[PDB]
Amino acid sequence: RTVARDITLLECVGKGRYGEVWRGSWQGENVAVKIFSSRDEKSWFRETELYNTVMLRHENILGFIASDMTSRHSSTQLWLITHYHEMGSLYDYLQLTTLDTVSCLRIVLSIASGLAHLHIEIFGGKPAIAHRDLKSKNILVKKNGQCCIADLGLAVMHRVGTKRYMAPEVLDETIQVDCFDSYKRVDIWAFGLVLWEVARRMVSNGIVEDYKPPFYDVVPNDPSFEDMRKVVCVDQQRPNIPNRWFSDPTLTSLAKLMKECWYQNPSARLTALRIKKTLTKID
Ligand SMILES: COc1cc(-c2cncc(-c3ccc(C4CCN(C)CC4)cc3)c2C)cc(OC)c1OC
Ligand SMILES: COc1cc(-c2cncc(-c3ccc(C4CCN(C)CC4)cc3)c2C)cc(OC)c1OC
Ligand SMILES: COc1cc(-c2cncc(-c3ccc(C4CCN(C)CC4)cc3)c2C)cc(OC)c1OC
């Protein structure tokens, strides 16, 4: 039989040190093609090894289609092919969109749902998985108003994470590296920062905050490991909760939830399943 493998690359939608992401076409359908730099080959290998272990299928996880390795004259070409989400990343979306109560809750609950699915061991099933680089650029917006989590290149089953989103135990190197729950608790910290990013863009009483990344007011762009350690570990700063949130019951509840993702003590932080339950009881 015929195995049609040609993908037409149509538009570059992302370029970085990782490599590039392209909108592509296969058999008349959009796909996303991540082309890896040689410097980030281990991210392709880790995502490929994970999907060869467990074929994750979840509405809030970016959908896997293929991993391809192709021999070139003097190099190896590595592609990861996934579902394509034309609305782009949550980071992108929040710059130029504000949210209402329903659309804010739907976004954050969908992220919590994807994260809880990664974290949970299922017997019969899937290993527990920690993401290790959760951030708004690694979350895509779907047309139905839910999101999905992307990029399992650092994931661990039971490159470093983006420094702006690193938990205090990563920055002060006290993380218990042989306890898998440690890695879940690092993801919860990052989730809380994403929850703060999104909540800022929810309108209440005619007020909204501008899009800003976590810690925009206390560290430079491309903050160093030391910059972050001083803020998060030494001074123990946390993102600001504006006064206007305390006039809105949804933002009041989201502020409480953020607080419980940001405890210095990793074992005090909420679990993804508890976050889901709390979000389902808001509004
Ligand atoms: C190798 O490379 C690529 C292949 C494809 C692709 C194209 N047509 C058909 C297929 C196909 C799927 C599944 C079966 C099954 C049928 C039932 N039988 C009992 C076992 C085998 C056969 C064929 C594939 C996998 C797409 C690609 O990219 C989108 C590929 O490149 C990454
Ligand atoms: C990689 O991705 C895509 C693949 C395909 C595709 C192409 N040929 C054949 C298949 C297939 C047929 C049949 C089985 C069998 C397996 C065992 N048993 C006997 C029942 C079912 C499995 C696989 C598929 C899935 C289509 C896609 O989209 C429409 C893909 O997505 C981009
Ligand atoms: C985070 O990581 C990965 C993401 C993706 C991915 C999947 N769907 C869609 C996208 C995308 C599409 C379009 C825009 C723009 C272009 C049009 N307009 C001007 C604004 C919107 C941005 C982004 C991406 C980047 C795939 C990946 O791998 C194949 C990723 O890596 C794991």
The full 3-state SS of the chain, as one line of letters, equals: CCCCCCCEEEEEEEECCCEEEEEEEECCEEEEEEEECHHHHHHHHHHHHHHHHCCCCCCCECCEEEEEEEECCCCEEEEEEECCCCCCEHHHHHHCCCECHHHHHHHHHHHHHHHHHHHCCECCCECCEECCCCCHHHEEECCCCCEEECCCCCCEECCCCCHHHCCHHHHCCCCCCCCHHHHHHHHHHHHHHHHHHHHHCECECCECCCCCCCCCCCCCCCCCHHHHHHHHHHCCCCCCCCHHHHHCHHHHHHHHHHHCCCCCCHHHCCCHHHHHHHHHCCC
First and final C-alpha spacing in the chain = 54
CA pair distance 253, 269, nearest whole angstrom: 16
Decide: residue 5, CB within 10 A, 0-12 exposed, 13-18 middle, 19+ buried: exposed
CA pair distance 153, 40, nearest whole angstrom: 9
Resolution at which this structure was determined, Å: 1.3
Is the CB of residue 66 below 6 angstroms from any atom belonging to ligand 1?
Answer: yes
**CA 80 to centroid of ligand 1, rounded, Å:** 15
Backbone angles phi, psi at 156, to 5 degrees: -120, 140
What tokens appear for 129 in the block? 């998985």
Ligand closest to 155 (CA) is 3
Backbone angles phi, psi at 157, to 5 degrees: -100, 145
CA pair distance 245, 179, nearest whole angstrom: 36
CA pair distance 34, 128, nearest whole angstrom: 25
Binding residues for ATP: 13-21, 34
What tokens appear for 97 in the block? 């969109």
Rama region for 34: left / alpha / beta (φ>0; ψ in -120 to 50; rest): beta
CA pair distance 20, 37, nearest whole angstrom: 8
Give the position of tokens 């679990």: 271
Is the CB of residue 14 below 6 angstroms from any atom belonging to ligand 3?
Answer: yes
What tokens appear for 79 in the block? 């592609």
CA pair distance 230, 236, nearest whole angstrom: 8
- Contact by Cβ (8 Å): 168, 188: no
- In testing the pocket of ligand 3, which one of 12, 15, 21 has its CB within 8 Å of the most ligand atoms? 21
What tokens appear for 38 in the block? 């040689």
Residues that are catalytic? 133
C-alpha angle 92-100-184 in degrees, rounded to nearest 5: 60
Backbone angles phi, psi at 241, to 5 degrees: -105, 115
Look at residues 267, 1, 6, 45 and name the one whose alpha carbon lies nearest to residue 154.
45
Atom number in ligand 3 closest to CA 153: 32
- In testing the pocket of ligand 2, which one of 1, 8, 65, 84 has its CB within 8 Å of the most ligand atoms? 65
**CA 40 to centroid of ligand 3, rounded, Å:** 18
Sequence positions preceding breaks in the chain, C–N over 2.5 Å: 124, 158
What is the CB neighbour count within 10 angstroms for residue 91?
18
**Atom 2 of ligand 2, residue of closest alpha carbon:** 65
Ligand closest to 6 (CA) is 1
- In testing the pocket of ligand 2, which one of 27, 33, 81 has its CB within 8 Å of the most ligand atoms? 27
CA distances from 261 to 11, 179, 193 (A): 37, 18, 8
Decide: residue 70, CB within 10 A, 0-12 exposed, 13-18 middle, 19+ buried: exposed
- Contact by Cβ (8 Å): 276, 116: yes
**CA 68 to centroid of ligand 2, rounded, Å:** 17
- Contact by Cβ (8 Å): 266, 169: yes
Residues paired with residue 78 on neighbouring β-strands, in sequence order:
69
Is the CB of residue 68 below 6 angstroms from any atom belonging to ligand 1?
Answer: yes
Residues paired with residue 22 on neighbouring β-strands, in sequence order:
12, 33
**CA 115 to centroid of ligand 1, rounded, Å:** 29
